[PDB]
Copies of this chain bind each other. A is one copy, B any other.
Amino acid sequence: MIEIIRSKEFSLKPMDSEEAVLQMNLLGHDFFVFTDRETDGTSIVYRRKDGKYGLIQTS
């Protein structure tokens, strides 16, 4: 029932969250994985239901 297929991060170049949202929006996706320029860690922006954007910054 579970088939997991790896894919790659769009870009490894660090970007800030506002540029990640722009990338997400150009793709038409509801989440986007990027390397965060703030932290050099992996961050994820995502579309909230209210049209704001969430940001998960991992260490």
Contacts and interface: CB of A to CB of B under 8 A. Distances in A.
A53 B5 contact: yes
Interface in A4-59: 4-9, 17-18, 21-22, 30-31, 33, 35, 41-42, 44-46, 48, 51-58
Interface residues of A, number: 30
25 contacts: A2-B18, A2-B21, A2-B53, A3-B52, A4-B17, A4-B21, A4-B52, A4-B53, A5-B48, A5-B52, A5-B53, A6-B54, A6-B55, A6-B57, A7-B55, A7-B56, A8-B56, A9-B58, A30-B31, A31-B44, A33-B44, A33-B56, A33-B58, A42-B42, A42-B58
